[PDB]
């Protein structure tokens, strides 16, 4: 129990920031909020990488930039569609992390 709780104190808040902001993206309907949500999301993706698993976040950060680029142009509808593919990769890192801890 102590070892499992130690892992939560390290990276669990980072995964809470990623998931909570992943619901704002699918709920907001303007490029002002999609870009704002992804900005907070990326800062958490880099933060979690600091703490093969590291290469997993390079795919995650790379997909945030690709979705943030579309939302920067003002194509809010495409950004939400592109953030859907982000959820599957983010979910995979969860299952890979829980197996290691």
């Amino acid at each position, epitope marked *: 129990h102590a070892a499992v709780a130690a892992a939560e104190a390290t990276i669990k808040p980072a995964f809470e920031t990623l998931n909570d902001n992943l619901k704002v993206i699918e709920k907001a309907d303007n490029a002002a909020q999609v870009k704002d949500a992804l900005t*907070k999301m990326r*800062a958490a993706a*880099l933060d979690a990488q600091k703490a093969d698993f590291r290469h997993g976040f390079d795919i995650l950060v790379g997909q945030i*930039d690709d979705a943030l680029k579309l939302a920067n142009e003002g194509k809010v509808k495409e950004a939400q569609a592109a953030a859907e593919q982000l959820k599957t990769t983010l979910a995979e890192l969860q299952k890979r992390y829980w197996a290691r801890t």
Partner: antibody
Amino acid sequence: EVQLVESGGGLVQPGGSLRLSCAASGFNVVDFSLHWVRQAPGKGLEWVAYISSSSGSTSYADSVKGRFTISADTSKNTAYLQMNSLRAEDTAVYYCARWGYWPGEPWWKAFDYWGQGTLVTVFN
Amino acid sequence: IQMTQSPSSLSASVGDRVTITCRASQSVSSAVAWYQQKPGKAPKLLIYSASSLYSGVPSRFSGSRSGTDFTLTISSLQPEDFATYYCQQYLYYSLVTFGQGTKVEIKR
């Protein structure tokens, strides 16, 4: 040796148009996005615009969006910044930065190499 | 986002220790860089990733991170480090904001 040089700065009438070019030598523009940052006389640095020639993307600062149009030409290995409808607050020295591509170390380097910078002044 | 840098001007003589504080408005992970602009010339990179050291600069320059509060520390001001230091964050290509700028001056 990696270096960047600018040109085109000079006296311009308010509401006129000026073109700045950042001739990059020592590398390829396709491998590094080029950014433009300006410093008003006696103030701190400020971001202006950037282009990622490999992906074709382009973003501008909220203070200059809709006027400036930054384009890159890999054949001539340069990067241009077309400036239209210049106002009185656009007098500054425009430095041409450089930045790597995610992932890897070069992204973390940030603006490692800078240009000399050209002075753009609007005059009546 | 927004970046705040303090102090805006400090004085320290040769061999003194200088600490410059830079606090981001929101979390930027560890994407912070420090530049040194000599008067009338292009800026030079000193610290990248807020804790590393760019190759080719004297080893006295040091960086630190404490949550969202960043710090640049100079161990001993030789008579070549009296210039303006800017705190930059580079969270993304389209969200680059620089600090106000700290100027180091001689003391008498």
